[PDB]
């Protein structure tokens, strides 16, 4: 019966040495997992800046496409008139 | 002396059933952790991509700014010479 005890001792010992490994390993995990929500936040933030930078670019496109057509029509005047003088 | 050792053993039955059951409880969690932890490299990658996309748009716009102030300043000379 004594040999039946010793095999339950040394067994429970290391069995504890294993539980202490899964716990010091879980703490490494938790530290990494505590970053997931922040990473999403960051993603949204950056996304937002982008969209912002996009509307600014999109509008700054009409402002330019209005000068072209304009400078064009205002070129017809400088062109169709000069030719008439010569 | 019998009930003693017997009781000293019955305190080991549960003792191992306690740690095994526990160990099993912790393995089921380490699995849930690994699932979530695979997300990290993916989320980090997403941040960089949105970052690079931001810069591109900025740069892209920054040039559209210098080509629009060159198209407007030259139009200043299409009216001047005009009259």
């Amino acid at each position: 019966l004594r040999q039946q005890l010793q095999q339950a001792e040394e067994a429970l010992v290391a069995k504890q040495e294993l539980i202490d490994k899964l716990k010091e390993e879980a703490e490494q995990h938790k530290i990494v997992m505590e970053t997931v929500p922040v990473l999403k936040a960051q993603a949204d933030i950056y996304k937002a800046d982008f969209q912002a930078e996009r509307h600014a670019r999109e509008k700054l496109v009409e402002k330019k496409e209005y000068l072209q057509e304009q400078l064009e029509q205002l070129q017809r005047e400088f062109n169709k008139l000069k030719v008439g003088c010569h | 002396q019998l009930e003693d050792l017997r009781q000293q053993l019955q305190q080991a039955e549960e003792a191992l059933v306690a740690k095994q059951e526990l160990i099993d409880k912790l393995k089921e969690e380490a699995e849930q952790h690994k699932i979530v932890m695979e997300t990290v490299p993916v989320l980090k990658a997403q941040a960089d991509i949105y970052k690079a996309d931001f810069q591109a748009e900025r740069h892209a716009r920054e040039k559209l700014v210098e080509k629009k102030e060159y198209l407007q300043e030259q139009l200043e000379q299409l009216q001047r010479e005009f009259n």
Partner: protein
């Protein structure tokens, strides 16, 4: 062989690929059923973004391997 392509939304589709298939191809197999442009796709495997030229075999992607997808905002 068969693999999985997952989004962070959780969505999981499957593609029938050959180990000798390029990332370029796989992207094109994603445009065919998801309609997503290939130039906005970014595939990830083992924490690494994958390259158009390399093949699945190169990054050692086996059957039922799970790849991760992330899309660009601009897409050149």
């Amino acid at each position: 062989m068969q693999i999985f392509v997952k989004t962070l939304t959780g969505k999981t589709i499957t593609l029938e690929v050959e180990p000798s298939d390029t990332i370029e191809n796989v992207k094109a197999k994603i445009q065919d059923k998801e309609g997503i442009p290939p130039d906005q796709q970014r595939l990830i495997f083992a924490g690494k973004q994958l390259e158009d030229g390399r093949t699945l075999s190169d990054y050692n992607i086996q059957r039922e391997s799970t790849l991760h997808l992330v899309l660009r905002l601009r897409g050149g």
